[PDB]
């Protein structure tokens, strides 16, 4: 016999039975589910469900407080892989599931971990002790490994693949902590889980290969290995995506973000054509309308044709106005180029084509002041250079291309545009908050500058990086699909970003922003050697994502 | 939620917080918003469900007449514009949901 | 219900136990049992007796759930069992052939099909025929990722289609269906995240909301609203990738910004006030590119208007921009306008529109009155990539730009109408300076903005390459489902679409359109359907 150091793919190890797994739960599951016809793909002789294949991996600190959760998993066809290749090719699936759990440790270590199987009608959250439901107790020092069965305990009579309804919950926890006696440098230990069908799984219904459901697809195949080292670009400025740069403390970005569900935070469908409007009052300062800057000013609400929201037209800059008077250019803010053009079936204006700086003052015309929230606010706009022209007509409005640049006077290290203390806030949002050690993060990118033409990547001065929120192929994903049951509320979906010396795992979760593990520093990450990009799963906020950098 | 304790001794109203001593019917009917909550945790008014102070910036203020000894105070705001509630701007936490009496002169009103 | 075997099982089954026991073989299993559909192809009344029609090779990919199932199996061995369905009518005639090739056999124009073992499929009947393909193979088992030689099943004219009718239809649809055999099996069980080099396919590039949504052309960034076709042909090079990983020109697919450095500025009359402001370059000076050196990044593709005077010049390319010294230079202030870019000759004397990229000259005149003009020998351009079109009156003047104005480098294919299929062109609605409010309303017709493919498609193109995704000679074929009506789109391999609206110049209105959905590569002797409500 092998002497226990050594196993192989059929052994299932010790088996531990905690009090769900009964000769009638498996009686019931196997007479009930015959209304879907004959079963299929049951064969005990095929390779695909007499061997166990691999699932996960995860990690066992010291620093990990009893009752922490360490891995979760719904009863699904996508915990094991053969299953998840065929269940695109069926509509239905009855049965239960078997865990093996290999501990990568050594004889010398403490500690217990603890696991159990959950009702379907419990929610599982913050205040769920899983040390109170019949459980099973693992040593650290294991060296065979321990086989979990967890059966279908469910209310219905199958489970539709587009609908399985209420289904248990496998958890695992620490019981006691981990312990080394010598200390220093080593910490932690991994634990890696295989599957295997249990005896009484099968499948039902034929239906066609990859058939639409009512339900949602795994939100894994929009961001690819091109969306990063290519194309794709930001939100507020069509840009390639250069670099990684996480905020302390958190932010709100709100013009053209969209959530999980379908929805979006007001104004700007996510297009960068232009921007249009027809009402808003035009008037210049001095006695004289030669070499002036143009004073345009609307009240939010004055938007009809927006088709979205009355509160702001199409495409809008989401920046507030930083006030300036005299020759003199502003710092950074939001500059584009545009003329003006009346109103009544008007031509634009000839002799006033410039670059207008945008924004939300108040108390215009007088005290111009900068904003914070939109609502009960007024958009506005004024030149920065000199025009020959100026129209004093209540009835006029806008043409600004949607491409921006920054405007700085002197350009030699000025600040990331723009912070989150100048990003403006509709009614109604959800604002980020720094769960863990994990902080919000914003894509970097390049964007051009008034003050220098060439503002290319090297030297002749050190770049200046514009931020934007979510990717414009992520957003454009988010736009039409509904994600409400492809990522429950509480976790969120993380990716594996694999560097030429490293490895970092990023999160998108239900509010549509982006976690990274870098706690509390500000140093740009330069995206130049990244290769591939391979999906995880859905992983609970309190976990914390590597930050394995070379 | 209904229990001997709450209609007896303990339990207040949710516009006056005073003490329940009765129960008035209303054979005509009425509707309710502000401080009122459903059967599927949700509001349609704009308050949290807590007495507490009422706090509002950003309005105009004025007296009428010219003399500035024993003169009305006055002040207003618009509906729409009160960030200060995550739950909704139409009136400021704490605001009543009674239409406003017009008084002037002295009088009190009813 | 009986299952048909094949006659070399026995010996199918022992030989492929090199590769271990046998998975995946349960008799009542339903997605065995079923025929399911497959493929679809054309009968036409041009077709000569012995052309060939339809033509599969052995492999677990003519099947929906075969092909699902070998996700995760490094090898398959066994056959094949096919049906045919003819749409038909009770006044059509003629017959086909369908026989198994074994390996080592040409298939081409000199096989005769009536000669094998064959079966008769006529143009009128009703029940389908059924056909099987055993798996005559010289190895032991067929390998995923390397398989050997394979039969191939080949579908030929035995008599020709007759229509006595007269004109309107001469085409039949024949509808192809599959479930295998009593003696498939797969073996050895593999990670599905394993080797996933699979049959790359050009169909997951033109989804839905591409066409009935978001999604812009490769000359602005507005929203496509409608196909127009013309017939003659065209070339176009700017953003236009075709199936290989290269393209023929300048201009990354991003509206970003045009950027240059270099090039002489000018301005005429005598007074520096109220004058049109002239900046002009000469090809090959691109060095800050990095694809290539004819022209900044952004530029436009359009040839130059002759106008003078202080009448706005029809059409063209306008962008609000401005001009910037050298020298780690900042933009002057006083001169910001809209200015209007293309490709000219004999600056600044005679200028004249030009047809090819070389020997020309890149330009750049203001359309509006700008107070101040410079005349400094450094000098460069900071625009907008997205613009609008000038126009004199808001009217409605024509599609933008025409065939013959589209300005092409040396060594660029030109699209030309193959049979009835015509070249089609995708059309957008954008603003001018006539009329700002261009609402999709009343008060005439509105400006259309023309380009050559969806920006979104060159994206998703420009990652991955398509060289045998598609075989020469064909187009990989969309069908686009209307309200009361349908049509079929095509893309050649060099990067073009077309249509089979014949000589025809009517837009065509993408409001009532539905869905999308991929057919495959089809012939471009075969017209593509043109069955709309009108």
Not at chain 1, 397 to 419: D, E, H, R
Not at chain 2, 77 to 87: C, E, F, M, R, T
């Amino acid at each position: 016999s092998v002497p226990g150091t050594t196993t192989d793919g059929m052994d299932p190890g010790v088996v531990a039975t905690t009090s769900v797994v009964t000769a009638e739960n498996s009686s019931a599951s196997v007479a009930t589910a015959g209304i879907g016809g004959p079963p299929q793909q049951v064969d005990q002789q095929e390779t695909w469900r007499t061997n166990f294949y691999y699932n996960d991996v995860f990690t066992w600190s010291v620093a990990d407080a009893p009752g922490s959760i360490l891995y979760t998993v719904q009863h699904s066809p996508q915990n094991n892989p053969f299953t998840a290749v065929l269940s695109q090719m069926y509509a239905g699936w009855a049965g239960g599931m078997q865990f093996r759990f290999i501990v990568a440790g050594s004889g010398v270590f403490g500690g217990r971990l603890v696991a159990a199987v959950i009702p379907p009608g419990i929610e599982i959250g913050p205040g769920l002790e899983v040390r109170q439901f019949p459980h099973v107790v693992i040593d650290a020092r294991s060296l065979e490994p321990v086989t979990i069965t967890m059966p279908d305990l469910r209310p219905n009579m199958y489970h539709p693949t587009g609908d399985p309804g209420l289904v248990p919950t496998l958890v695992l926890s620490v019981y006691n902590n981990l312990i080394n006696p010598f200390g220093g440098s080593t910490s932690a230990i991994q634990v890696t889980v295989e599957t295997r069908p249990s005896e009484d799984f099968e499948f039902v219904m034929i239906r066609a290969p990859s058939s639409k459901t009512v339900d949602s697809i795994s939100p894994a195949g929009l961001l690819t290995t091109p969306v990063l080292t290519g194309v794709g670009n930001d939100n507020r400025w069509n840009g390639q995506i250069v670099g990684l740069q996480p905020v302390p403390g958190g932010f709100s970005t709100c013009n053209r973000h969209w959530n999980l569900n379908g929805s979006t935070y007001g104004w700007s469908s996510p297009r960068f054509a232009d921007i249009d409007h027809r009402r808003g009052s035009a008037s210049y300062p001095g006695n004289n309308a030669t070499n002036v800057l143009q004073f345009w000013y609307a009240n939010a609400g004055s938007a009809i044709d927006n088709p979205i929201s009355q509160v702001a037209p199409d495409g809008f800059p989401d920046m507030s106005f930083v006030p300036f008077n005299g020759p003199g250019i502003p710092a950074a803010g939001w500059v584009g180029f545009g003329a003006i053009w009346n109103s009544n079936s008007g031509a634009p204006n000839v002799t006033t084509v410039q670059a207008y700086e945008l924004g939300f003052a108040t108390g215009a015309p007088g005290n111009l002041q900068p904003t914070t929230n939109t609502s009960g606010s007024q958009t506005v706009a004024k030149s920065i250079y000199a025009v020959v022209t100026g129209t004093a007509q209540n009835p006029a409005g806008l043409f600004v291309m949607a491409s921006g640049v920054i405007s700085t006077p002197s350009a030699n290290a000025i600040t990331y545009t723009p912070q989150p203390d100048r990003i403006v806030t509709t009614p109604g949002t959800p604002a980020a908050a720094p769960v863990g050690k994990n902080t919000p993060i914003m894509f970097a990118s390049v964007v051009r500058r008034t003050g220098d033409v060439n503002a290319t990547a090297g030297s002749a001065n050190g770049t200046q990086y514009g931020t934007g929120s979510q990717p414009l192929p992520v957003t454009i994903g988010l736009s039409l699909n509904n994600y409400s049951s492809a990522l429950m509320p509480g976790q969120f979906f993380v990716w594996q970003l694999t560097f030429a010396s490293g490895f970092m795992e990023i999160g998108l979760s239900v509010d549509g922003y982006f976690y990274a593990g870098t706690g509390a520093s500000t140093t740009l990450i330069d995206l130049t050697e990244l290769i591939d990009v391979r999906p995880v799963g859905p992983r609970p906020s309190k976990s914390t994502l590597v930050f394995n950098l070379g | 939620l209904l229990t001997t304790p709450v209609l007896t001794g303990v339990g207040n109203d949710n516009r006056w917080n005073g003490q329940i001593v009765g129960l008035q019917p209303v054979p005509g009917g009425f509707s309710t918003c502000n401080r009122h909550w459903n059967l599927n945790g949700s509001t349609y008014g704009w308050s949290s469900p807590r007495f507490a102070d009422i706090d509002h910036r950003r309005g105009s203020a004025s007296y009428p007449g010219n003399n500035a000894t024993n003169v009305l105070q006055f002040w207003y705001a618009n509906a729409g514009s009160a960030i200060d509630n995550p739950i909704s701007q139409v009136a400021p936490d704490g605001f009543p949901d009674m239409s406003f009496v017009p008084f002037n002169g002295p009088g009190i009103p009813a």
